[PDB]
Amino acid sequence: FNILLATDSYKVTHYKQYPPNTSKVYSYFECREKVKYEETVFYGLQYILNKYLKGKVVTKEKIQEAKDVYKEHFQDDVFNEKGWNYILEKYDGHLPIEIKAVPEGFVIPRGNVLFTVENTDPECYWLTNWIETILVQSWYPITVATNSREQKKILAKYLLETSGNLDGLEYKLHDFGYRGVSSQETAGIGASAHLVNFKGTDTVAGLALIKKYYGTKDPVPGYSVPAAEHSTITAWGKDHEKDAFEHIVTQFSSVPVSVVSDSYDIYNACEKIWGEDLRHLIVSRSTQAPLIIRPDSGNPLDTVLKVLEILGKKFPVTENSKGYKLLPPYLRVIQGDGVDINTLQEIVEGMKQKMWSIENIAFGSGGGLLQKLTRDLLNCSFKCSYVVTNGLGINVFKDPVADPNKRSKKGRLSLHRTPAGNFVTLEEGKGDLEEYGQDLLHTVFKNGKVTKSYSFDEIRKNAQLNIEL
Amino acid sequence: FNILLATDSYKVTHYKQYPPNTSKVYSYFECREKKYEETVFYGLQYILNKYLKGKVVTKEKIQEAKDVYKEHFQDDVFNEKGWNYILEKYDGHLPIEIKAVPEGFVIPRGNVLFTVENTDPECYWLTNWIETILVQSWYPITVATNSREQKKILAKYLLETSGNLDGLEYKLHDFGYRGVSSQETAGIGASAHLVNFKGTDTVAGLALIKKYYGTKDPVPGYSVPAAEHSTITAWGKDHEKDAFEHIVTQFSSVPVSVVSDSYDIYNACEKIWGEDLRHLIVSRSTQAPLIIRPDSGNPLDTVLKVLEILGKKFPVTENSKGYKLLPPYLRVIQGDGVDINTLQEIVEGMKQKMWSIENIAFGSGGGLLQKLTRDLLNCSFKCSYVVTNGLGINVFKDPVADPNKRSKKGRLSLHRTPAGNFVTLEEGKGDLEEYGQDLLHTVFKNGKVTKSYSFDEIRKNAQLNIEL
Numbered sequence A: 001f002n003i004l005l006a007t008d009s010y011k012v013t014h015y016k017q018y019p020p021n022t023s024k025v026y027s028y029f030e031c032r033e034k035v036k037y038e039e040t041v042f043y044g045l046q047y048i049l050n051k052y053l054k055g056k057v058v059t060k061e062k063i064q065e066a067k068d069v070y071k072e073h074f075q076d077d078v079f080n081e082k083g084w085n086y087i088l089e090k091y092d093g094h095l096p097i098e099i100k101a102v103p104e105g106f107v108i109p110r111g112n113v114l115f116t117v118e119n120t121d122p123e124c125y126w127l128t129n130w131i132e133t134i135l136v137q138s139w140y141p142i143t144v145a146t147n148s149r150e151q152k153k154i155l156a157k158y159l160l161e162t163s164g165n166l167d168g169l170e171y172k173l174h175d176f177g178y179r180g181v182s183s184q185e186t187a188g189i190g191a192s193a194h195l196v197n198f199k200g201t202d203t204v205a206g207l208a209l210i211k212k213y214y215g216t217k218d219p220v221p222g223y224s225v226p227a228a229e230h231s232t233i234t235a236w237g238k239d240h241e242k243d244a245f246e247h248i249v250t251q252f253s254s255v256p257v258s259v260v261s262d263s264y265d266i267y268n269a270c271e272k273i274w275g276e277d278l279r280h281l282i283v284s285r286s287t288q289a290p291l292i293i294r295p296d297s298g299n300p301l302d303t304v305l306k307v308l309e310i311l312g313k314k315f316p317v318t319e320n321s322k323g324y325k326l327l328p329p330y331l332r333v334i335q336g337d338g339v340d341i342n343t344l345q346e347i348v349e350g351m352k353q354k355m356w357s358i359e360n361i362a363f364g365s366g367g368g369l370l371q372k373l374t375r376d377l378l379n380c381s382f383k384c385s386y387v388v389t390n391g392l393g394i395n396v397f398k399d400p401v402a403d404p405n406k407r408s409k410k411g412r413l414s415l416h417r418t419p420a421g422n423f424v425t426l427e428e429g430k431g432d433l434e435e436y437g438q439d440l441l442h443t444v445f446k447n448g449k450v451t452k453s454y455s456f457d458e459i460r461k462n463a464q465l466n467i468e469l
Numbered sequence B: 001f002n003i004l005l006a007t008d009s010y011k012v013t014h015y016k017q018y019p020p021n022t023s024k025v026y027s028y029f030e031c032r033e034k035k036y037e038e039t040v041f042y043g044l045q046y047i048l049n050k051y052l053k054g055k056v057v058t059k060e061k062i063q064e065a066k067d068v069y070k071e072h073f074q075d076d077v078f079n080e081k082g083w084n085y086i087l088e089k090y091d092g093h094l095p096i097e098i099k100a101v102p103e104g105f106v107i108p109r110g111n112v113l114f115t116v117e118n119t120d121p122e123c124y125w126l127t128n129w130i131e132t133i134l135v136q137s138w139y140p141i142t143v144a145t146n147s148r149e150q151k152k153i154l155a156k157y158l159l160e161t162s163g164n165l166d167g168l169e170y171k172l173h174d175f176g177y178r179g180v181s182s183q184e185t186a187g188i189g190a191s192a193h194l195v196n197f198k199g200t201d202t203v204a205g206l207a208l209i210k211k212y213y214g215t216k217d218p219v220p221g222y223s224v225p226a227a228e229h230s231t232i233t234a235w236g237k238d239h240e241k242d243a244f245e246h247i248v249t250q251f252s253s254v255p256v257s258v259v260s261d262s263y264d265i266y267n268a269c270e271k272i273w274g275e276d277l278r279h280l281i282v283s284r285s286t287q288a289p290l291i292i293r294p295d296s297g298n299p300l301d302t303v304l305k306v307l308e309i310l311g312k313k314f315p316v317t318e319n320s321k322g323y324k325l326l327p328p329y330l331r332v333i334q335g336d337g338v339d340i341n342t343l344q345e346i347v348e349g350m351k352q353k354m355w356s357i358e359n360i361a362f363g364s365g366g367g368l369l370q371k372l373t374r375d376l377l378n379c380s381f382k383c384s385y386v387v388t389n390g391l392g393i394n395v396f397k398d399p400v401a402d403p404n405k406r407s408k409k410g411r412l413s414l415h416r417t418p419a420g421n422f423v424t425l426e427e428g429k430g431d432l433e434e435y436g437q438d439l440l441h442t443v444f445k446n447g448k449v450t451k452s453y454s455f456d457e458i459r460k461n462a463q464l465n466i467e468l
């Protein structure tokens, strides 16, 4: 990786565009005020700081490589070779930048400063926004973690209402998204952000990222169980679906096992194969090793409701203390097709209306969890708010006439608690007046070193739901 | 990177689930039919080289996978024996054969694009182990296809309003680096866009193409100097004119894009560019025009109003098709809110107001590289053929509630039809040789990349019919 080649092309030309004699550029990131997504989980900056920003990130070879690429890319010499060589020669290639940030896992309302960036050497005024592109990619772990947490809120509300408790909540939304993201790197980042809120994942890449960059007291941060796919059912031949089911549940007789049941006819599979032909292999299973029946096609709500009605007529159903129907403990359902935050809500509400406890179901979500998200969902944005030119600090901002939502904050910023205990971002250096106590941002990066860090266990604690607290 | 840790967790358990006595699992990838009628096949070569080729198994990688899965499953289910077999027998090279349509080929939906099978009977479980990594080809396929569909829209409008396609390759600029989910995604996605266009600010695409594909030219994509809000607003609100003047003077002999909406896009166009600094604009060369960049408001309404303002402050001509044309030193780039749908809305609105598409280019970020999912083209990998007890059987899924999810049966091959279209033959019927040559070629076999394509070849294959 070369940091010189890790920015938007136009930023190569920006050192020539700032006012002459500018010694400081100070910028900030927020999730701009616009499912409402009123609060965001701050997560993922520590990965970027360690993987890409810390240590000796400039070398002679990297400067020469960037110079050669940009000469052809712009068909002109605009690259700031002198400016990058200064960092190499004066700081042994360590970035003279200070980043302050809210602690990871913190849950912060929209429209608040989450981190700030400024140069610590006047010669490197151009460096602050060079690294905008790499830092703004924190939108992705923030957005995955936030959207996953919002689904946890829905699941908690309906589990509490239909069961009286939150038992099993952290296994109710399983990450199926490894194949449906855009790269291996994205898979690890996104899976780790989901694991802020839940413990079930099939996206193995998230485990090593957490281990390397954050850390947990437990050996791994996420868990899985054996499960079938269409290839392991259909390979037996259509007339032998029962044989596949029997082989798989017998191979995994002592752990939970998920069996995709829709290869040919989900309803026949539930009613006749699981329901009658193999029922004796299901009712014998342990409470710690249930069969998890997995539909994977059709209208998600309609299919879940019909699967439950079928199973409730073939297996003993109880009524829990809240009055909701409950399958026996050796039998559960996972809906892992078509699940995003909207369809999740529709399914749990439809189950509730039909008197089925949320204890009976879990969800797998792939593209909806890790890929169908954009930087626009939370309006993640990085902007310059303060500069020093000719020794004079200036509060700077953008205020487009057509769009008030794009207006940006002015001056030096700080994050505080209000008297009622909420968050406020103070502008124009007003945090210095100390009317709102101390700034909640902490220096996390300075002059090539990570200066403050969070374990994954601390991040999880910070991101807990109120209903959990 | 450890390929043992690069699969969906459940696939760790599948070796125990296939029918006993199974010696072959054969699987295929298609962009299922459900408008995106045709897809650009692009990106597999990156995956083959970065992740699949060579010695990908070691004793350390097996032990690390064994340790992780013991904790991840709270059980010992990992196939250590099967992975050690590959290590000891093949020096850690994967006994897999992959056949694929040439990269850059434009193929209608519902056709086989690549197949995967094991070459050693002991490794029947390996074909679908690597499904997860191979299915991520959905992303470069989808970026390249969606970018090409935008090129079709641009080409149709440019041709209608101008009579030619001059400049088409620079009409959709990649602004997506900050709006994708990772550095790796940025390079992959930017490279897929460059199949169709030459303008990019997502620098990461250049090194990927150089390392994995190659071009005869030094670089596959190009940029020009451009401002951002920080370089305008840093001058102070009262000094926007000073920022504009400084920037166009610093870049007086190359094209320069200047974001103009920091405070009031319409004031900037009419009064700053159109009056105060007009003398610095009309003196510019055709080779180095000023590109005015709005970045907020309704994308169509803003473009039309910007053009109306500029048309009243600068000399406008009428081209031979009857459409209005700004002077050659002045152009506009709309780089906010652009996806395939709004691009179409903008060029159609311009046409209705008699403005040539020569006047405009588009920047797209999230719309171009992030707002896409595997479901857009229904990219899917399924087993279609197995050999069990020495007999081949045709395998498929056919869910009752969704006919669109039905998969193909048996050994597959891709052919040209007599009318020049494409057909996927199932059940090994390609062996009857009624349809000429199979278009799938072996690209990977037993840890080696057998066939490779340059980026120049891929671009040629992905050309539009109108260009042809």
Ligand SMILES: C[C@@H]1O[C@@H](Oc2c(-c3ccc(O)c(O)c3)oc3cc(O)cc(O)c3c2=O)[C@H](O)[C@H](O)[C@H]1O
Binding pocket: A168, A171, A172, A174, A200, A201, A223, A224, A225, A226, A227, A256, A258, A290, A291, A292, A332, A333, A334, A358, A359, A360, A361, A362, B010
């Ligand atoms: C059968 C369930 O398995 C485990 O939870 C998971 C579920 C699950 C399923 C249905 C439910 O109603 C539910 O409450 C949970 O499903 C999984 C599926 C996978 O592919 C992988 C997993 O790890 C779980 C996974 O860990 C937990 O052991 C849960 O206690 C048990 O009820």
Ligand SMILES: C[C@@H]1O[C@@H](Oc2c(-c3ccc(O)c(O)c3)oc3cc(O)cc(O)c3c2=O)[C@H](O)[C@H](O)[C@H]1O
Binding pocket: A010, B167, B170, B171, B173, B199, B200, B222, B223, B224, B225, B226, B255, B257, B288, B289, B291, B331, B332, B333, B357, B358, B359, B360, B361
């Ligand atoms: C000023 C234009 O530059 C080049 O195209 C680009 C454009 C562009 C703009 C407006 C138009 O109406 C248009 O036809 C093109 O914009 C760019 C913007 C960037 O940030 C970077 C670029 O490389 C181009 C970029 O390369 C083309 O060579 C075009 O001939 C010329 O008119």
Ligand SMILES: NC(=O)c1cccnc1
Binding pocket: A175, A176, A177, A178, A202, A227, A228, A258, A336, A364, A366, B008, B009, B010
């Ligand atoms: N474990 C599963 O059922 C699963 C995992 C990943 C993708 N699809 C299904």
Ligand SMILES: NC(=O)c1cccnc1
Binding pocket: A008, A009, A010, B174, B175, B176, B177, B201, B226, B227, B257, B335, B363, B365
């Ligand atoms: N060159 C540009 O105007 C640009 C690049 C990347 C993101 N936004 C704007």
Ligand SMILES: [Cl-]
Binding pocket: A228, A229, A230, A260
């Ligand atoms: Cl599956």
Ligand SMILES: [Cl-]
Binding pocket: B057, B058, B059, B060
């Ligand atoms: Cl080894």
Ligand SMILES: [Cl-]
Binding pocket: B227, B228, B229, B259
């Ligand atoms: Cl910008």
